[model samples]
Target: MELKNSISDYTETEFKKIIEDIINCEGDEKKQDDNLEHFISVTEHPSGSDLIYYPEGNNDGSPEAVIKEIKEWRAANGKSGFKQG
Candidate 1:
């Protein structure tokens, strides 16, 4: 499922909040996976594979790893990293 936009397209504010929401779903099976799936499907490789993971394409999908992936990618790409958290 290739996303039309990269994680870069998402604001750091929303991106961080999304991962937070996903984590907030902890202990709730459906919410956890559903929220994570939505996040991954909406944010992935800019135009390459549709996978988003800390390891990149390994499909880790956990909230912790996903946030790390987004943060690193944005920073490495020269995009401004999250601030004012």
Candidate 2:
């Protein structure tokens, strides 16, 4: 799939780390349960796609930061459009 924009414009490694953090945190049973419940409620009719790769410092169900790394990936690959798949 093509990235929407240039990856150079985003903090690529930081973004990846964010995702890794969330995945690693799944070992917590309480957190996992909370996450499951939250997912069912919030995903009833999701409006758009989101990537939560890290846990919020406040235990919120949101990404720690929103990085526009897709742009950089596109630029590197000579892609000229949004991701398609």
Candidate 3:
């Protein structure tokens, strides 16, 4: 099945990585909602640049924390941010 048909299409692996990133950053268990199983739900705006969540319980973290985490993740992976589809 498809995950999301918003701004971009993602392979299963890519989609999983996005989900994992949110989990790691938020450390929130709310991402496991049953509704999320059908699509990639986002709590933040639809820019696709911010962290998305199940939209019910997760705190979207501070802006500073989000940037820090994304940078750290990229550094650890030896990569820079690329626009995603």
* Overall lDDT per candidate, in order of appearance: 0.54, 0.37, 0.40
Candidate 1 structure, TM-score to reference: 0.42
Model 3: per-residue Cα lDDT over 34-76, one tens digit each = 3233232322223334344332223355433433444444556
Query: Clashing pairs in model 3?
Result: 8-85
Candidates sorted by lDDT, descending order? Answer: 1, 3, 2
Top candidate by TM-score: 1
- Evaluated against the true structure, the overall lDDT of model 1 is 0.54
Question: Where does candidate 2 clash, by residue pair?
Answer: 5-71, 6-71, 6-72, 7-71, 7-72, 7-73, 8-72, 18-53, 19-53
TM-score for each model: 0.42, 0.25, 0.26
Measured on C-alpha atoms, candidate 2 has an lDDT of 0.37
Candidate 1 vs candidate 3, lDDT winner: 1
